Each structure stands twice: as structure tokens, then as C-alpha cells.
Amino acid sequence: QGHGE
Amino acid sequence: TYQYNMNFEKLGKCIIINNKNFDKVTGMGVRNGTDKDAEALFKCFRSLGFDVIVYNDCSCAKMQDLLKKASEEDHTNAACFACILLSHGEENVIYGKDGVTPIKDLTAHFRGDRCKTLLEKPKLFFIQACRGTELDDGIQ
Amino acid sequence: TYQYNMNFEKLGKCIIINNKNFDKVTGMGVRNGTDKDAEALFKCFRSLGFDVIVYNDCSCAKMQDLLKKASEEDHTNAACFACILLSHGEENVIYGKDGVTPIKDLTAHFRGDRCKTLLEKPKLFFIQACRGTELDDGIQ
Amino acid sequence: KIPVEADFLFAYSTVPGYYSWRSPGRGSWFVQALCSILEEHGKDLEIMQILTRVNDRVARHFESQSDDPHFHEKKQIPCVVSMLTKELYFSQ
Amino acid sequence: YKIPVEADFLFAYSTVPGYYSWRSPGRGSWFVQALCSILEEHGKDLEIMQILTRVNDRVARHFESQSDDPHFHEKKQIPCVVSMLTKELYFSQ
Amino acid sequence: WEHX
Amino acid sequence: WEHX
């Protein structure tokens, strides 16, 4: 996935 | 890459040790509400995809044997491993129904050099127990 | 929401304790290569936006006092706080040139009730030191 | 080679030296928080994001209530110890 | 209302409890080298826990102590992160 | 509210 | 390498 600020 | 690989047949085994009643000699009282936790925990980890089993009021030898045995299984088709300890406890140790046992001795069984099938796979331990007697007062 | 608020005048103070030389009586040796770490860290943390300060060969009283005074300054306009310790160590302890001091006593100066201006703000501690005398042999 | 201690993650219900509060009718604070965050984000958040949210939920939403003025209005902060070497998601 | 006194602390130890931590006289320690390296490349765009997780991997893999002694020969190291943080931490924006 |  |  990938974190989102 | 940057994330553990979850592409396995099984997510993994989830051991939940739910100690509620203790021997008189230990001087520990009943942990009311621990059954509420165990069930909520059972459903959650089950929903995540874990093959969870719940063992009740375990002796120190029992908890030790459970973890040792589980470390000896074949996790080749498992993505990871998880263990949940619910009990009375003190800094570095946890209570069986008959006394205390070192937490490291429980988890050590899974070191890379002692469980090849879980090597490079996450080993998770959730512990709900005390770790001392100091109280947090809070602020503002 | 789910992120620490970073909208402050300044990012914060970054204290680096670079312990390289120790008193003969402690039995500790020179830590060659520590200046290499100290310069790398300072350059790196300055780029992040921290106001970094580098301390060298500090005694235990100095480390304690140094951090106590930092916890008493006014951090109202800072997003967070960061401290980096480079020295000899043993489980739960960090070395001063003087001798030995508990890591918990060094970080406690910043607890919520003793440093109201860093309340609800991240307090980071990076530590380069040993924590026992065991060697990890490896596997595979 | 791989460090034998690597890839372990411990989620304690409290920091070293303190108490862990448990409500006979509602269960412990840590477990309550852990389950509610997992039953709502377990499949979409990284393990560390999850436990961080559990940390906050336990630190905020709770506050003990007892007779003895000594154990009155007490707080709790969980502790996460990670030796993981990759991000962990319980899906895909 | 209130907040725990031990809250919002994060400890990043170069090694797990009970073990040694390695350092080079000409290169520096493994943990610091790695930390700085990852911070240069991602300090501005990765959450703190992502950066330290990556630092854990780098120390665990890349390095291996080369010494002329069977005891200290080809040994490993795994960093240790202790978190009491209650939010995600990004060093920018 | 008790403790473990 | 040496140790700390």
C-alpha cells in the first residue's frame, strides 16, 4: 500500500 | 520489498492464553472481564484470517509447552505467527495459574535460530498484564 | 487527526551527546568512529530543521544537568524534541566519562508532568550504546 | 544471515513498571481499544499505524475510578516494541 | 481531560536488550550510519516508524562484523524501537 | 476498575 | 568493528 499524510 | 510477504495459504496460528483463575498459593485474585477480552480478541484475530485457539488457566509448564510446541510446528505455508497473553504479571514475567514464568522464555522459542519456518516472517506478541506497581497520574 | 501537529515556529531542539573519551577507572576505552557518527547526525538533523547542539565527553552529572535544563526551557513554539546519545552502555544504562547513569533518569526529565511545554508533543531519543554482552550469531 | 532477534513485535498494554487497568464488566482498556481499532481498520492499516491509534485511544478515552484517593483518576499508556524489518499489512 | 506522563515518547535503540552494538573506527556505528542514510533519502517524506523500520532492515542485512576471533566473527545486530507515540509523525508540512 |  |  502506502501511507497518506 | 518494503512490506512483509502475505502471499501464503495461511495467515498464521494465533495462540491466546487466557488466565482467569489462579492457585491460592500465588495469592492472585480472579481476573473478571478477561473472558470478555478473550472473546473479542478471538473474533478480531479470527476475522483477520488467523487460525486461533484459546487455552484457559494455564500453568507455567503448560504455557511453556504450548509455545515450545507451536515453535516446533511447520509454518512454511504461514505468513506469520501471533500470540496473545492475558494474565496477571510483573516486570519481565507473567503469571501461570501456579506461579510466574519469564516472558522471554516464552518468546525465545521463536528466535530465527530456533524456528526456521518463521524466519523472516513476523512474530507478534500482545501482552495484557501489569509490569510494575507505579501509577500514572496524568497532567492538565 | 492522526498526525502530530507540525505547524510551529520551529521544529525543535536536537541534543547530541558525543561521548568518546572515558576515565581510566571506568575501564572503558576510546570510542573511535564516534565523531564520524556525531558529524553525520548533526548535518542530517540540521537538514530536517532541528536546532542541533553537540556536546562532547560529558560526565554523568553533566548529562543529567544538561537534559534537566533542556526540559525546563520553553518549548511552546516547537513541534517536538530530539536527543541522541552516543556512548558505552549496559542494559538500562548509559556511560558518562565519569561512570554510569540510568537512561530512564535522563529521559524522565521530559515526562508530561515535568515538562508541560512538550506535552502532547513527540519526545524522541536515539541511543547508540550496548545493552548487555551477548552476540547475535545469525542464521541462514 | 539474519539476526535471531529480528522480526519480533511486542505490544504491551502498559509501559514498564506500571499498572494495566481492567474493567470486570467491559474488560481491559488495552484489549478493548485493540479490538475496536482492528475490527475497523485491521485490513487497511499498517501494524504500526494500528497500534499507534490504540496507544492514543487508551491514553485518551480512559481514566480509572476507585475509592482509595490514591488510585483515583489514573491513566495508562501502552508500549510497542518493534524489531520488524518491513511494513506489515494483514491482507492482499 | 488528562494524558499519561509516559506518553509521546519514542526510543530508538541501536540494539535489542542484552546485546552488543557495533561500531567502525573509520566508518562509525551501524545504527547511526543507517539512520542518517535513510533520513537523507526519506526524512521529509516517511512516517517516523517507516524510517526506523527501514533502518532495522538495513542494520539487520547490510552489515556483519568481520573480526579475527570465532566469538566476535561474522555477528549480526538488530535495532530496537520502543513507541509510546499516539500519532503519526512526519517531519514536514 | 482493577489491575493485572 | 568494535562494540559499544
Q: By the 8 A CB rule, do C46 and C116 touch?
A: no
B114 Cβ contact partners less than 8 Å away, ≥ 6 residues apart = B71, B108, D4
Beta partners for C78?
C10
Q: By the 8 A CB rule, do E4 and B138 touch?
A: yes
> Which residues form the domain of C45?
1-140
The single residue of B14, B60, B80, B88 carrying the catalytic annotation is B88
Measured distance CA(E22)–CA(C93) in Å, rounded? 17
Kind and range of the H or E element at C47? helix C34-48
Interface test with B, best of D2, D8, D23, D64 (most B CBs within 10 A): D8
Measured distance CA(C65)–CA(B100) in Å, rounded? 39
Mark which residues 1-4 of G lie under 8 Å from E by CB: 1-4
Query: How were these coordinates obtained?
Result: X-ray
Number of folded domains that form chain B: 1
Neighbours of B6 (CB within 10 A): 17
Q: Nearest-CA neighbor of E14 among C136, C77, D47?
A: C136
Supply the CATH number for residue B23's domain.
3.40.50.1460
DSSP classification of residue D87: B
Measured distance CA(C130)–CA(B15) in Å, rounded? 33
> Which residues form the domain of E75?
1-93
Q: What is the CA radius of gyration of chain B?
A: 16
Supply the CATH number for residue D42's domain.
3.30.70.1470
CB–CB contact B107 D8 (8 Å): yes
Residues of chain B with Cβ-Cβ distance to D66 below 8 Å are none
Residues of chain D with Cβ-Cβ distance to E77 below 8 Å are 3
DSSP classification of residue B41: H
Measured distance CA(C136)–CA(E67) in Å, rounded? 14
Find the angle CA(B51)-CA(D78)-CA(D65) to the nearest 5 degrees: 110
Largest separation between any pair of C-alpha atoms in chain F: 10
With the C-alpha atoms ordered B66, B68, B70, B72, is the resulting torsion angle positive or negative?
negative
Residue whose C-alpha cell reads 509490569 in the numeric block: B131
Å between D53 CA and nearest CA of chain A: 14
Cell of D6: 529480528
> What own/partner pairs with CB < 8 Å and gap ≥ 24 does B100-107 have?
B100/B60, B101/B60, B101/B63, B101/B64, B103/B127, B105/B64, B106/B63, B106/B64, B106/B67, B107/B67, B107/B83, B107/D8, B107/D10
Chains A and G touch (3+ CB pairs under 8 A): no
Number of folded domains that form chain E: 1
Could you tell me the resolution of this structure in angstroms?
2.6
CB–CB contact B136 E4 (8 Å): yes
Beta strands in chain C (DSSP E): 10-18, 51-56, 78-86, 89-90, 93-95, 100-102, 123-128
DSSP classification of residue B113: G
Largest separation between any pair of C-alpha atoms in chain G: 10
